[PDB]
Each structure stands twice: as structure tokens, then as C-alpha cells.
Design a protein around this ligand. Structure first.
Ligand SMILES: CN[C@H]1CC[C@H](N(Cc2cccc(-c3ccncc3)c2)C(=O)c2sc3ccccc3c2Cl)CC1
Ligand SMILES: CC(C)CCC[C@@H](C)[C@H]1CC[C@H]2[C@@H]3CC=C4C[C@@H](O)CC[C@]4(C)[C@H]3CC[C@]12C
Lengths: 232, 468, 53, 336, 215
């Protein structure tokens, strides 16, 4: 199947230079938009970089604008993120993420394992709930309150729900708040309207424990919530 | 302190040339050039020569019959104040420009002392105002006969009679008609199968024709009951100068922009056609076509260049009107700008069009010789016909560029002389009263007929492609 | 000739069908066509409010 | 040897039977109905991506994604709303004559002039589309591939046969062979129970998907019939022909119900289809225009004349929001 | 617009670019429709110059694509309209089958049918009067009069071939638009593809000058 693996991690001196190689194998890489997203050791996710299909358009985050450079090689199927002059706030795990944007597509589907790099006006998706314990067998709803009405003129509500498992890569659970992510059990159900969203997990069992991030996709930069970790 | 001791004599003439003298004493001290009252009258009727162009004449009249015919008060001659002098120095410099202000009228602190009664205030010059045939009463400092005050040149060219205007009307009518009909004929030929004939070189030829047709209808915007008056004549009754004005109607500025855009678009379309032919004929056979790939960019390019040139015109615009031709067109006032703006595009187009056409003909000549497949007689016949034909078309283009260029230079030099000739004429027309008058040189009208023939010949040249 | 045998077999099989008088057929056609006059964006052109084109 | 005479005896018997119970005069009933007057339509959007003639159109169940065939050999799945493309599937056999679209909206079934209905897969991981199976076995040329489910395809071939395939096994699970001439058009039913074949023998036949034995055989045409489409009720259907006479047959009465004909037309019919309600009939002529007929009065209603060449395919949406005509101008227009 | 629809438009433009490029690349090739009556000689020239069978070759920097339809059993009028806009129609004719059985008359009927067809008013016709090697000796015993009643002349290949060529080239009703070329296939050369090249470059030149607004 799809095989995203990344390399070039470790530790760097502050003000140093490093390149991160995301090697994609086992799909048509020349037609896929690629996102770079990071995660601090003990904080929520944050958006870093985006490259479109065929190097047509590029986007960076406010924090890392002008410092980081993103490039793609189609005939070798490689994604290079070169960073220079590292700050103390860049020590993080780094995932390269697949995306394809056409009608009735499922962007942010497959997330690579990622690498550890350490050193020596927009929408704020303020996810209200932080921690809540559960018992297996019950159904539970988790809600995150948006800072801006996402419902566009087209009729779509650009919100995604991602699940992360303990010591795993976070996988896509719901896309556009309605349609189920492919290869996901029919237990999960997303619902809500403008500035009000909720994911209801019905008859909760094991192999569902972990953390839940709701992520808006209306303008760029895209921002993840604080998240809610469902304790055993 | 505006009084001198001079013995004067009682008046013999009781006029300020229109105003009754309210006094009974007159000296000849202020008149430095005059000696006796007879010579005073002589200089009075001399400066009566300023009868025409009244906007300074009516206000100099006080000074005229104040210096020559002053007022004595018991062996004490009056001297006018600074106000009467400075009222007739700046805008009334006709005496300076032509003959020069003599020593007596140069108001100096002894001649013209400051701050005393003028006494001429009672002499009101209301009975004043005259403009001759080449002049018209206007009240617009924008549109006057800049060199002369008072009046302005009329709308109708004074170098001719209405016979010559009718002659030119008949000329433009004939040529506009024939070209319009022939261009509508080719337009009909291309549009009748327009749903089929979308092949690009032919489409480019269609667009050339279309541009020349709208140029023709532009030139044919006259012969109506009230056309020439609304187009080239102003509200006051002056010819168009410094087109377009932000004061009056935008009637002929549009008839200018359409015809200029028409011709420039047409010629740039033509050079693009020549380039398209060269690049096609390069890849004649082998079913490879360069033109089809980049069509959109070159199509955009051709449309923009005339528009950027015409706005570069409208930025600092000396475009104006014409009664002999009957169209507002550029640079009739100033030879230099029209010279540059006509010569530079045509020079460019000849140098590049000629080159591309020569490369095109040299290519499709060599293809007969060196093509690996033996070309059949049926193909060789057509390629030899097209070779000869492009040669003749290039020859006609060259001929038209030569005739226009030569006529332009001739016009530039002759206009440079005509300006001075006309100035001498209007001076003579002002001097007819003092003590009609021959016109040195005129616009030889046949040369502008040549120019119009050249324009419409170029117009007809781009329609031989349907005459098969 | 087995082609002709199959043909006569099919004709015999098809011959015995319970026909319906067109009196009722056309009536059913008119009834169906008339009953659905409201949900046709081609007959009565819906205003530009709902029409997404 | 003489059994053909007994066959023609039964032929005359069935003709006498179907006529004896025909007091139809359909027009003499419609007089009470109020006329549709005159309906005009404007080109809401133009989809322009092809570099040759297009041969087929099919609206997805979404009534948004239409698939269109081509002659260059590049079927491109249009998005009818924003004029956007989603996939440009480059098929091998550059000759195409039909396209289908799965009711689920997963598989696109193509296949033209080399006897291979090649089904594709859109909703797959690993990015690009792939040739899932190439259904081969026909001896003539594929005329119309149509999907029933995501597993069962019915194909009208050019060798006088109609084949129901099974995608999972990739073989002709059922064959129907009653025609003498090339079977040029196929049309499924709303209930998906029984389809209608239009052949080159100037005779339309009703087949059975489940069983396999033809139940009705409607004649009456002088020339080839080029398109069939079911009345949304599923008890009647229109037939466009080369005689310029689209006619509506009844599945219950077992004969022709009424005729459509206008004197000044001598061209051939290409595609016929009904609006969701089933009041007006869209018909694609060779006059470079499509005619909207009143399917209850035979009176001409509208003329959509916005093409420089003949209209080769005509799709009405499964919600009646718009019609889409595919010309030979390398454009296909969406009218409303 | 919106966020991901902006990317949707990028995808649309990108695949439109790929489609234009592939179209440009494909259109630079030349396509030759290869007709022929059954057993005329269609199997000879296909190899000598080296459902539907797309067979392409290359000679002197041109991409030639022969489409042979002879190996398909269907109504001609139904699928023939598909091949409009093809450059040339290679119409192979069996010459030796003048006596075999009527076959000449059948080939003549097919030629008359496809030459004056509504779709192919514009396109040129190249025909190879093939199998001359066996034909030349066949008329020593069996005169041409057996096939043609209205012929009167010598039974010499040099005349017989010329008369049959004239008889076939007479059929085209439109003389002023579509040219007819003719050759006799010779075993020992690569001159057959040379002739094809010469005829194709001729029609291409003529079409290009017609497209050039001069002709
Ligand atoms: C393209 N061939 C040219 C030939 C020269 C033609 N030509 C030049 C011209 C045109 C228009 C305006 C002026 C002009 C404006 C203001 N002050 C002086 C001259 C000159 C005139 O016939 C003359 S000379 C002249 C002198 C005095 C007043 C009128 C006047 C006019 Cl009319 C035009 C066509
Ligand atoms: C293709 C080649 C030959 C183009 C030829 C350029 C000629 C036809 C164009 C370019 C500039 C144009 C001239 C510029 C302005 C004037 C002055 C006017 O009072 C008479 C018309 C006349 C003289 C124009 C006639 C047409 C013209 C001469």
C-alpha cells in the first residue's frame, strides 16, 4: 500500500541547518498536494508548510515564514523540507501528510510515521473539553466550538476530525463533518451547524482510546484544536 | 508730481476715434515721435492700425488718445499713472512682437509718474470690437490666435475656397465608398462560411480587413447636413486646437481615436500575419505548425499596442481638427509629434515586415529545390504562384511606405514655411486700413490627395486575397 | 432450419399475452404525466433562488 | 419446410389481435389537456476540454458529475456545476462509441470500436484510476454499455446480440440473441427489472434481465432506430429513427401509441430522452439542433439550436435540473 | 472561491495542460485508413512497407498510422463516419482476380460506394493495383474481354494495366477537390512506402497552403 517514511532527524545546535526527506513509495506522487505538520513533545498539533501538485502554489505558517523552504522531486518521489537558524520552539515530531483536492475527495487521509528534530486574525478552533474518562460499551459525544462560521456559499462545512492512538501516527476519522473516512468502522458520527460541531462515538470499545483533534480548513493557515484525550 | 511745463495749442480734432474730447487743450510732449498736431493725427491713425483684435485695442485707446491728445492745466501737461501703462504691456505685446514699443510708450518714472489722477476715466471706450474674415470674436484665452489678441482663427481653412473643400469631400467620398464596398465584400466572403473558416492565418487576414473597414466608416463620418460643424468646428466658431479640451464636447476626439486605432491595429495585424506566414512556411509539410501553440499571446499583443500608443497620444495631445480633410487627427498644429508618431511605427513595420516576408519567400523558394519527396507539378504550380504573389504584395507595401514617407517630409517643411506665410498675410490684413494682399505659398492640395490615395490604396491592397 | 424452429417457438410463446385496451393505457399515461407537473424544473422554470445552475 | 407459413399465420394473428383491441386515437384524448405553449432554454454553462468529436454522455446519480466520451481516446469526468475536471482517463483503444456511470458513482464503463467494454475504478486509494477489467467476447463492435449495479453490466454489441456480464468473473453470464440487424441502442428500467434493445432491423425488442426470453417485439419503422429511453413510469418508451419519426410505444398495449413527425425535416434522430416528470421529449437531430417535443400532443415546443455540427449524445439528469447535449464541435452544452 | 475549490481549479488547469500537450503530440502523427475487398491483397502492403488493428510505422521523420478495418463484419455506413478527418485512404485492389469468382466488379462497386460517400468528399485516395506479377502472364490465355464487355484493344500488360487504371480513376464524381494517386507495388524495393510518403506530403502541402489563406 502507500508507504510514507521520513529521515534526517536527531539534534541540532541553535542557529543550525537541517534538511528533512519525506520519501513516498507506492502511489502516484506527481498528483498529490503535500502538507508538513509538526507536534511538540507534550502540546497539540500545529501547521508548518504546504506544497500543491506540480509546485504550482506554496503556503507557510506565520511563525516559520521566510525561514523554512519546501521542495518536491517528482521523478525520485521525494519531499525536502530545509530549515535554517533553528529556535528552541522547533523541537518536535514532524509528519509529511498526503492530500488530493477534487470534488468528493478525502484530503489528509494517510499520515507518515514522522521524525524527531530537537535542539540543545486567523480562525482559533478552541476545543473546549481537554480530558474526560469513559467506560467501554457507552456512547459519548465530543464537541469543539469554532471562532468563525465555516459554512461556505457552496453548502459544505470545512471541518475534519483526526484520531491519534498512544505512540502512533494520527489517522483521518471524519472529513467535512458528514462523510466517514474510508476504512473506518460505522460507530463514529459527525454532526452540527455553523459554529457548533460534535463527533458522537457510539458503543465505545477498546482500539478507540487516544486523543481527538478537530481541524478547520477554511483559509490558510489551518489550525488544530487543543484536543480531547479519552482516558480508559 | 505728474506734471511738466510745456506750451500746448487748442485742439483741431474733437475725437478719440469714437469718443468726444471733453477738453479744449492738447500738447505733443508725451508723443516723443510726433512734433505737430498733423503728425499727432498721423500717429493716431497709424495706431488705429490696431483696429482689429479689440480685447487690447479698446483698453489701449485711453493711452492712445491720452499720450497724443493730453490735457493742459495753465501750462501744466498731465502724465498718466502706472495703472493705464501696465493694463496694456503684458497681454498687449503685439507692438513689441512686431514693431517694438518706442521710447515714449515705455512708461519710465519721469514719463509715467505713480499715484495721481489719470483724467481719461471719463473717456469710456464702449464703441469698440472688430474681427476681419480670418478672425472671429472669441472670449476664451485657451482658444485665441495666440500671437494676436482679441479674435481667433475660424473653423473653415482660410487658405482655400469652398470649391476646394467640395473637391476634397468628393475625393474622400469616392475613395471611402470604393474601399468600404470592397472591404464589406471580403468581410461577407469570410463571414458567409465563418462557422467553417476558423483556420488562423485567414482569420488574421479577416481581422486586418475588419480593422480597415472600421477605419473606412471612421473616415466616412461626414457628408451629413450638420456633420463638419459638430465634428471640427467649436461652439465659439474656432477650429479645434489642443484636442481634446476638458471644457467643450468630446465629438471629434472619438472620431479621431477610432480611425487611429483602426489604422494602427490594421498595420500591427498585418506584420503579425507576415510573421505567422514565415513561421508556417518554415514548417511547410511534415504536419508541424508553430503558430497554433502561441496564438493567444500574439493575439493579445496586436490589440494592446495601438491602445497604449493612442493613450500615450491622449497624455500630451496636440491632436486637433481639419476642414480640408474633414477629420480631427493628430499633430496638424505641431509637425514634430505627428512626424515621430507616424514615421516610427511605419519605419518599424517596414523594417520587420520586409525582413519576415523576405525570409518567408526565401524559405518557400528553397522548399521547391531541397524537399526530399519529389514535389508533384500540382504543388510546384501553387507554390510558384504564391511565391510570385507574395513578392508583388511586398512590392506594393514598399511602394505605399515610400509615398507616405516622402509626402510626410514634404508636408513637414512646407507647414514650417506656411506658419510664417500666414503670419505675414494676417499682418497684411491688419495693414490694409493703414494707407486685398497676395498669399506667398499655399497647401498644394494634390499632395494631401496623394496621402488619401496612399491610405485607401493600403486599404484596398489587403483585399486582393479573395480576388482568385 | 433450426433458426425458423426457434422463431416459431418464440412467436407461439409471445402470442398468448393478456392485452389491455388503450382506453386505460393512455388514461394511466395522462394520470402519471399530470400528477408530477410540480416537480419538473423544465415545464415551470423554478426561480433563480433554488436553481443551482 | 413450410412452417414459416404457419409462423406468418401467427404473425398476422398477433397483428389482428393487437389492432382489434386498439381504439387508441391518443391525440383525440389529449385535446382536453392545456398546451405547454413555447419553452425556450439558454446555455447555462459550456464544457470545453476535448480536441475532437465526442460520442457519449452520462449523468451520475449525484446529478453533478457527468462522464463524457471522446475521439482522441481521453474520457474526462466533468463537474457540471463549476466547469471543473476531476479525472482525465486516457483509454488505450482511441476509438470510443459509448460511456456508462455506476449508480453508486464508483466505476466508469467505456469501450468503443474494438469489442472491449473496459471498466475503470475512480474511488480507489493510491491516487490515479486503473483499468479494473476488460470485458471481451463480442465479435462485432460495442454500441452501448450500461450498469445495473456495481457488479452487473449489460452491453448492446454490433453482432446482433446483447450480453449481461458479471464483473467479478469477467464472462458473459447471460446472452440474448433474437435480432437480425446490429443492436445500436440499449435502455434500462427505473425498477432495473427489464431493458429495451433498439436494433438495425427497424424493430425494437423488450428483453428480460432475470430470465432472458424476449416478451414484446415492436415493429412499425421503415429505417434504422438509433436511441431508446423508457417513460419514467416504465410502461412506455420513445424510439428515434433515421426516418426522422420519433414514436412512443406502450409496453402494456403491445403496439405503437402515437407518432411524432414534421414535414420539412429529412435528417436522422441520434438520441431521445424524457424530463423527470415525462411531459416533454428531448430529441437530438442532424440539423445541428435538439428539438423539445410535447410528448402528449406531438406539437413542437422548443428548438435548442446552439451547435455548429450534429448532436451525437443527449443526457437528462435523474432529478430534471438540466439537459446536456454533446455535439461534434468538441464542446458539450448544459441547457436548462 | 473557497480554500480547497481553489486547489480543485489548480488540478483542472493542470490536467487541461496535460490534455493539450498529449493532443498536440498525437495530432503531429498522420493517420491512413486502409480499405480493401476481401482477399484483394491487404495482407501484402501492410508488411511490405514495414476487431480494428492499429499498425504504425515511421519513414523519413513522419509517424504513419495504418488503420485496417477489413477484419471486421458490420454495416459500413454505421462506423465509417468515425474515420472522417483521416489524411489518406489506401484502397488496395486485387488485379489478378479480374477473372476469379466478378471480384473486380465487386471491388469496383465498393470503390464507387466509398469514393462518393458524404463523409469523404475532401480526402485524397491512394490505390495500389497489386499482384501485377501473376496478372501480366494471366492474359496470354484469358483476354480482359471476359471481365469487361466494352473494352477493345491489345492484351499487353502495358495497355491492360493502363486501361484498368483509367477505368477505376474515372469513378470519382468530384474531380476538382480530391486527387487520385496510383502505383503498381514492386516486390524488390522500399519504393512503396516512398510512394505513400510522396502522395501524403503532396496532400499535406496542399492542405497546409489551403489553411495558410493562399492555397
Ligand atoms: C497632412 N497634410 C497637412 C497639410 C497642411 C495643412 N495645414 C496645417 C494646419 C492644420 C491645422 C491647423 C493649423 C494651425 C493652427 C494654429 N495656428 C496656425 C496653424 C495648421 C493647413 O492647411 C493650414 S496652415 C495654417 C496657418 C494658420 C491657420 C490655419 C492654417 C491651416 Cl488649416 C494640414 C494638412
Ligand atoms: C501596410 C503599410 C503600407 C501601411 C501604410 C501606412 C499608411 C497607409 C498609414 C500610416 C499612417 C497613416 C497616415 C497618417 C496621417 C495622415 C494625415 C492625414 O491628413 C491624411 C491621412 C494620413 C496620411 C494617414 C493615411 C494612412 C497612413 C499613411
Amino acid at each position: 500500500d502507500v508507504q510514507l517514511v521520513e529521515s534526517g532527524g536527531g539534534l541540532v545546535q541553535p542557529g543550525g541547518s537541517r534538511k528533512l526527506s519525506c520519501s513516498a513509495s507506492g502511489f502516484a506522487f506527481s498528483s498529490f498536494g503535500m502538507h508538513w505538520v509538526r507536534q511538540a513533545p507534550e502540546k497539540g498539533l500545529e501547521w508548518v508548510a504546504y506544497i500543491s501538485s506540480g509546485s504550482g502554489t506554496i503556503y507557510y505558517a506565520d511563525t516559520v515564514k521566510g525561514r523554512f523552504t519546501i521542495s518536491r522531486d517528482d521523478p525520485k518521489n521525494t519531499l525536502f523540507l530545509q530549515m535554517t537558524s533553528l529556535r528552541s520552539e522547533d523541537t518536535a515530531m514532524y509528519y509529511c501528510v498526503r492530500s488530493i483536492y477534487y470534488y468528493g475527495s478525502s484530503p489528509f487521509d494517510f499520515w507518515g510515521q514522522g521524525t524527531t528534530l530537537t535542539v540543545s486574525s486567523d480562525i482559533v478552533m478552541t476545543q473546549a473539553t481537554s480530558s474526560v474518562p469513559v467506560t467501554p460499551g457507552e456512547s459519548v459525544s465530543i464537541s469543539c466550538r469554532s471562532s468563525k462560521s465555516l459554512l461556505h456559499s457552496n453548502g459544505n462545512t470545512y471541518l475534519y476530525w483526526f484520531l491519534q492512538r498512544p505512540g502512533q501516527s494520527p489517522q483521518l476519522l471524519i472529513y467535512r463533518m458528514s462523510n466517514l473516512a474510508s476504512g473506518v468502522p460505522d460507530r463514529f458520527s459527525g454532526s452540527g451547524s455553523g459554529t457548533a460541531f460534535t463527533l458522537t462515538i457510539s458503543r465505545l470499545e477498546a482500539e478507540d482510546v487516544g486523543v481527538y483533534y478537530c481541524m478547520q480548513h477554511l483559509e490558510y493557515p489551518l489550525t488544530f484544536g487543543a484536543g480531547t484525550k479519552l482516558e480508559l | 508730481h505728474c506734471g511738466r511745463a510745456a506750451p500746448c495749442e487748442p485742439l483741431r480734432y474733437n475725437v478719440c476715434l469714437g469718443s468726444v474730447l471733453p477738453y479744449g487743450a492738447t500738447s505733443t510732449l508725451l508723443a516723443g515721435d510726433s512734433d505737430s498736431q498733423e503728425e499727432a493725427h498721423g500717429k493716431l491713425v497709424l495706431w488705429s492700425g490696431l483696429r482689429n483684435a479689440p480685447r487690447c485695442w479698446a483698453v489701449i485707446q485711453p493711452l492712445l488718445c491720452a499720450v497724443y491728445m493730453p490735457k493742459c492745466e495753465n501750462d501744466r501737461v498731465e502724465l498718466p499713472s502706472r495703472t493705464l501703462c501696465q493694463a496694456t504691456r503684458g497681454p498687449c505685446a503685439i507692438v513689441e512682437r512686431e514693431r517694438g514699443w518706442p521710447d515714449f510708450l515705455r512708461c519710465t518714472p519721469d514719463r509715467f509718474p505713480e499715484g495721481c489722477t489719470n483724467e481719461v476715466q471719463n473717456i469710456k471706450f464702449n464703441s469698440s470690437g472688430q474681427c476681419e474674415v480670418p478672425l472671429v470674436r472669441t472670449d476664451n484665452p485657451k482658444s485665441w490666435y495666440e500671437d494676436v489678441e482679441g479674435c481667433g482663427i475660424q473653423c473653415q481653412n482660410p487658405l482655400f475656397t469652398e470649391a476646394e473643400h467640395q473637391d476634397m469631400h468628393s475625393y474622400i467620398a469616392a475613395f471611402g465608398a470604393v474601399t468600404g464596398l470592397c472591404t464589406l465584400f471580403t468581410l461577407a466572403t469570410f463571414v458567409a462560411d465563418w462557422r467553417n473558416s476558423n483556420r488562423y492565418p485567414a482569420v488574421i487576414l479577416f481581422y486586418v480587413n475588419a480593422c480597415f473597414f472600421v477605419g473606412s466608416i471612421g473616415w466616412l463620418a461626414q457628408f451629413m447636413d450638420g456633420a463638419r460643424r459638430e465634428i471640427v468646428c467649436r461652439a465659439d466658431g474656432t477650429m479645434r486646437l489642443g484636442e481634446p479640451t476638458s471644457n467643450e464636447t468630446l465629438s471629434c476626439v472619438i472620431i479621431f481615436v477610432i480611425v487611429y486605432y483602426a489604422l494602427m491595429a490594421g498595420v500591427v495585424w498585418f506584420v503579425v500575419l507576415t510573421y505567422a506566414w514565415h513561421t508556417s512556411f518554415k514548417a511547410l509539410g511534415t504536419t508541424y505548425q508553430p503558430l497554433s501553440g502561441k496564438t493567444s499571446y500574439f493575439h493579445l499583443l496586436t490589440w494592446s499596442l495601438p491602445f497604449v500608443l493612442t493613450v500615450a497620444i491622449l497624455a500630451v495631445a496636440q491632436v486637433d481638427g481639419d476642414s480640408v480633410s474633414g477629420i480631427c487627427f493628430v499633430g496638424y498644429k505641431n509637425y514634430r509629434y505627428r512626424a515621430g508618431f507616424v514615421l516610427a511605427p511605419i519605419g518599424l513595420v517596414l523594417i520587420v515586415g520586409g525582413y519576415f516576408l523576405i525570409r518567408g519567400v526565401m524559405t518557400l523558394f528553397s522548399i521547391k529545390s531541397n524537399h526530399p519527396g519529389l514535389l508533384s507539378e500540382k504543388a510546384a504550380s501553387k507554390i510558384n504562384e504564391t511565391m510570385l504573389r507574395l513578392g508583388i504584395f511586398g512590392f506594393l507595401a514598399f511602394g505605399f511606405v515610400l509615398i507616405t514617407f516622402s509626402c510626410h517630409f514634404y508636408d513637414f517643411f512646407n507647414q514650417a514655411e506656411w506658419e510664417r506665410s500666414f503670419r505675414d498675410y494676417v499682418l497684411c490684413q491688419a495693414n490694409v486700413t493703414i494707407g486685398d494682399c497676395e498669399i506667398k505659398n499655399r497647401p498644394s492640395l494634390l499632395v494631401e490627395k496623394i496621402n488619401l490615395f496612399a491610405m485607401f490604396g493600403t486599404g484596398i491592397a489587403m483585399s486582393t486575397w479573395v480576388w482568385t | 432450419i433450426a433458426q425458423a424452429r426457434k422463431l416459431v417457438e418464440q412467436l407461439k410463446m409471445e402470442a398468448n399475452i393478456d392485452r389491455i385496451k388503450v382506453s386505460k393505457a393512455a388514461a394511466d399515461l395522462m394520470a402519471y404525466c399530470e400528477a408530477h407537473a410540480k416537480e419538473d424544473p423544465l415545464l415551470t422554470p423554478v426561480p433563480a433562488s433554488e436553481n443551482p445552475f | 419446410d413450410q412452417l414459416r407459413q404457419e409462423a406468418e399465420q401467427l404473425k398476422n394473428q398477433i397483428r389482428d389481435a393487437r389492432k382489434a383491441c386498439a381504439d387508441a386515437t391518443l391525440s383525440q384524448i389529449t385535446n382536453n389537456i392545456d398546451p405547454v405553449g413555447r419553452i425556450q432554454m439558454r446555455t447555462r454553462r459550456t464544457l470545453r476540454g476535448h480536441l475532437a468529436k465526442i460520442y457519449a454522455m452520462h449523468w451520475g446519480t449525484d446529478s453533478r458529475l457527468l462522464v463524457s466520451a471522446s475521439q482522441d481516446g481521453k474520457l474526462i469526468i466533468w463537474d457540471s456545476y463549476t466547469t471543473n475536471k476531476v479525472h482525465a482517463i486516457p483509454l488505450r483503444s482511441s476509438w470510443v462509441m459509448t460511456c456508462a456511470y455506476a449508480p453508486s458513482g464508483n466505476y466508469v464503463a467505456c469501450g468503443g470500436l474494438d469489442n472491449i467494454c473496459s471498466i475503470y475504478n475512480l474511488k480507489t486509494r493510491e491516487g490515479n484510476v486503473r483499468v479494473s477489467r476488460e470485458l471481451a467476447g463480442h465479435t462485432g463492435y460495442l454500441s452501448c454499455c450500461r450498469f445495473l449495479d456495481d457488479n452487473q453490466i449489460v452491453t448492446s454489441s454490433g453482432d446482433t446480440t446483447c450480453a449481461l456480464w458479471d464483473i467479478e468473473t469477467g464472462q458473459q453470464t447471460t446472452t440474448f440473441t433474437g435480432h437480425t440487424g446490429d443492436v445500436m441502442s440499449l435502455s434500462l428500467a427505473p425498477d432495473t427489472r427489464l431493458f429495451v434493445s433498439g436494433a438495425c432491423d427497424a424493430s425494437a425488442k423488450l428483453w428480460d434481465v432475470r430470465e432472458g426470453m424476449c416478451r414484446q417485439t415492436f415493429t412499425g419503422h421503415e429505417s434504422d432506430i438509433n436511441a431508446i429511453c423508457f417513460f419514467p413510469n416504465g410502461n412506455a418508451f420513445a424510439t428515434g429513427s433515421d426516418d426522422a419519426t420519433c414514436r412512443l410505444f406502450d409496453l402494456r398495449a403491445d403496439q405503437e401509441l402515437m407518432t411524432y413527425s414534421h414535414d420539412n425535416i429529412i435528417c436522422g434522430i441520434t438520441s431521445v430522452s424524457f424530463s423527470k416528470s415525462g411531459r416533454l421529449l428531448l430529441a437530438g437531430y442532424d440539423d445541428f439542433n435538439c428539438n423539445v417535443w410535447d410528448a402528449l400532443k406531438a406539437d413542437r415546443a422548443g428548438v435548442l439550436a446552439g451547435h455548429d455540427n450534429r448532436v451525437s449524445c443527449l443526457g437528462v439528469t435523474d432529478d430534471g435540473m438540466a439537459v446536456a447535449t454533446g455535439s461534434w464541435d468538441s464542446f458539450l452544452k448544459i441547457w436548462n | 472561491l473557497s480554500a480547497e475549490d481553489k486547489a480543485a481549479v489548480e488540478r483542472s488547469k493542470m490536467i487541461d495542460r496535460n490534455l493539450r500537450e498529449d493532443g498536440e503530440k498525437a495530432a503531429r502523427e498522420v493517420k491512413l485508413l486502409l480499405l480493401g475487398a476481401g482477399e484483394s491483397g491487404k495482407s501484402t502492403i501492410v508488411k511490405q512497407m514495414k476487431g480494428i488493428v492499429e499498425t504504425h510505422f515511421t519513414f523519413k521523420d513522419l509517424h504513419f498510422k495504418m488503420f485496417d478495418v477489413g477484419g471486421q463484419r458490420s454495416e459500413r455506413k454505421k462506423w465509417i463516419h468515425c474515420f472522417e478527418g483521416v489524411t489518406a485512404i489506401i484502397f488496395c485492389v486485387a488485379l489478378s482476380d479480374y477473372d476469379l469468382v466478378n471480384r473486380m466488379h465487386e471491388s469496383m462497386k465498393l470503390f464507387d460506394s466509398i469514393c462518393n460517400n458524404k463523409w469523404f468528399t475532401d480526402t485524397s485516395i491512394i490505390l495500389f493495383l497489386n499482384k501485377k506479377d501473376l496478372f501480366e502472364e494471366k492474359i496470354k490465355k484469358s483476354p480482359l474481354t471476359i471481365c469487361y464487355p466494352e473494352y477493345a484493344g491489345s492484351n499487353t500488360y502495358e495497355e491492360a494495366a493502363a486501361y484498368i487504371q483509367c477505368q477505376f480513376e474515372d469513378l470519382n464524381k468530384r474531380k476538382d477537390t480530391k486527387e487520385i494517386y496510383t502505383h503498381f507495388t514492386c516486390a524488390t524495393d522500399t519504393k512503396n512506402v516512398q510512394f505513400v510518403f510522396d502522395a501524403v506530403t503532396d496532400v499535406i502541402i496542399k492542405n497546409n497552403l489551403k489553411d495558410c489563406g493562399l492555397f
